[PDB]
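Methods: holo model generation. Sequences were used as deposited, without trimming of termini or removal of tags, and paired with ligand SMILES retrieved from the corresponding compound records. Each pair was processed once, and we did not select among multiple samples. The sequence and QGH SMILES for this entry were:
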Amino acid sequence: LKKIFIESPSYAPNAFTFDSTDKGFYTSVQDGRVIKYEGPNSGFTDFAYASPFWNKAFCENSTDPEKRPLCGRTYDISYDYKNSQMYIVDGHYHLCVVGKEGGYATQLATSVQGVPFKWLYAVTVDQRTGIVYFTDVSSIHDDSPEGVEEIMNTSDRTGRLMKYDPSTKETTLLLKELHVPGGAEISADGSFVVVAEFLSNRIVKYWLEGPKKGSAEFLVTIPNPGNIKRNSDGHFWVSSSEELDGGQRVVSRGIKFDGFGNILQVIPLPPPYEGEHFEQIQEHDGLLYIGSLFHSSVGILVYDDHDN
Ligand SMILES: *[C]C1(*)(*)(*)N(*)[C@@](*)(*)[C@](*)(*)C2(*)(*)(*)=C1(*)(*)(*)[N@@](*)(*)C1(*)(*)(*)=[C@@](*)(*)[C@](*)(*)=[C@](*)(*)[C@@](*)(*)=C12(*)(*)*
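and the model returned the structure below.
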């Protein structure tokens, strides 16, 4: 297992997505930007900003939590191929979208059933229907240090799963009282959405079709599950960390599972991720993109097989 680091601006490149050109990638960073890597000999450019207030002088390269409400902080991004546009979920500006050329994003939704969003975290677009599925970590606590602390202390179970439909412009509540839903990924065939409940160490399966449509069921136990991203085979990669029996400390792993809950592949991450929580593992073009809040470079894994 080989690791590659790509030096990036700002800090904490946590989430990735890709467009039809498939040259490079997009990533969300701590200072409120969505940036685009253009290739090994042309670095990063700014792509988009959820916050309409974002500006270089005040927000570029900041990690001051006090500047977050103004600059924004995007937690996930999902490219819509049919419409050449990028969906965004931000901790301060909520569900947004930006067209192909980027720039400042258009805000789409900030509440459901009269209850404001507090910390949108994961997003995915159904490539066939253009319908957007996304999670809110809490209905009480935002991404401030004070908020994170309260979520932990009260074992906050006020997370939600929503859908947004661009043809109605309405958003609908699918699930409530989730236990820190930091990951959500639609099946290849659109029949279900898998949701990671970080504080309950599990993945649940929410049905979009079939006789159980509109309900969710337990799928598989995963320690401290984060983001979920589907690969081209239709399987799901999730970030995981497990406290080590005998240690102290965690062991970090990427875990690939199917829609029936079978564990298909387990990848212990190498340093520096090995003993740290991480955000996401996403398979694309034969590479594993690793999202984290704890580094200033993007991490990518590939296996070296030049001997067998
Ligand atoms: C799951 C992950 N991501 C989302 C959010 C979060 C996580 N974890 C935690 C802890 C505490 C608070 C919040 C959180």
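Residues 121, 137, 148, 151-152, 180, 182, 198, 226 surround QGH (CB under 6 Å).
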